Symmetry: C3
Subunit: 147 residues, 3 copies
């Protein structure tokens, strides 16, 4: 059941990003989110079929790059913030939490079955990237994060 | 010592379709909750502009999911019948017939309505997992699992229909 | 792997006392579900809402942040009778504005009302996680009693939002 559950949560995460993608977004953000949807598709395909790996260092390198890029666009967070703000920002936070949920099950799968570490490392980074994108979307809307 | 009066359920339990009391983390309660969550997500979908037939089907499905939750609330009860399953089969055939052959894989998204349909789809599959988990701890007729299994496929097809309609 | 290690890459997460637990631990699941709930409320808050309802939901977001903190920080409590009293107050406040529910309702209606019902179900989900956690770890009753009341309040608010939209509750 661990594998079935992980496959499902990743699918749920990808669907939530589809909802975020239905919102107005900066071009750079839309492109990243779109590529991520393909990544999650490969990730899901990998958790399922045994002996087949699809997530590589390059995938992790791309997330690290987007993290570095977007974080450089924002001043370090000084105070704790609450999930919300502009609709796109709020949706990004929902995606963030669903990604963390998908991470918990992926970690569960790796604990009871031979699993490559790339999957969990990918969603670990995606969780942090969605947090940052929420901030970007709040600023892009002309607002600020909810403190 | 809390000075706040207790409310039903404060002790971490909830009542079933009888005098039965169970702890909220019980497999049966999780199954009931996930079906409720799925129904709520469909409610969000119903707040979108929709083609007439799609709305009629989803509206009807909410009543079915209510009955399904009811069936799970009463261990010794059965609300979902083959008639419910049969109706989902009919909808599947009806809508699949409206759509052209699916040659390549597709990612969840598109118009907001289609995107929400995919969320309903994944939440429906999550509810199916909880219902399956319930069957591992208690005897359970198949109608519930069969219903949600069929519904997740329908939601997939409806997502495609909604994109077409939403452009 | 030629990729540098990031905090959490090993499948664990840090608690407030510096200790680290695997991410599938029951405690992390409860913290996560509370976080998910707070995020859904944030989506509801992005909708057009009556000012009193917005003020209430915004305050609740602060409570849930504190609630998550209590679950994450050992030797740290944050939810008190005051928090539970405020919820009871809002429940009495809003229920009094509505006619008695004579029949079962389906989750949905106006967009804001539908989203409130989603929050309600995610809240119940978080409650199941908090309960599972307290089943193997010493927990104050407060967190559990808080989300227990919040679930009912989100149901009530859903009805309020359907009223405000001039619509009604789906039967």
């Amino acid at each position: 059941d661990a594998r079935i559950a992980a496959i499902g949560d990743v699918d749920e995460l990808n669907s939530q990003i589809g909802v975020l993608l239905a919102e107005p977004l900066p071009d750079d953000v839309r492109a990243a989110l779109s590529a991520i949807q393909h990544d999650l598709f490969d990730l899901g395909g990998e958790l399922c079929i045994p002996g087949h790996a699809a997530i590589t260092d390059a995938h992790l390198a791309r997330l690290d790059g987007w993290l570095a890029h977007y974080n450089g666009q924002l001043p370090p967070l000084e105070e704790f913030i609450l999930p919300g703000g502009a609709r796109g920002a709020a949706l990004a936070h929902v995606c963030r939490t669903v990604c963390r949920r998908a991470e918990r099950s992926i970690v569960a799968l790796g604990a009871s079955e031979p699993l490559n570490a790339a999957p969990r490392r990918y969603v670990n980074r995606l969780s942090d990237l969605l947090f940052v994108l929420a901030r970007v979307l709040n600023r892009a809307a002309g607002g600020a994060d909810v403190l």
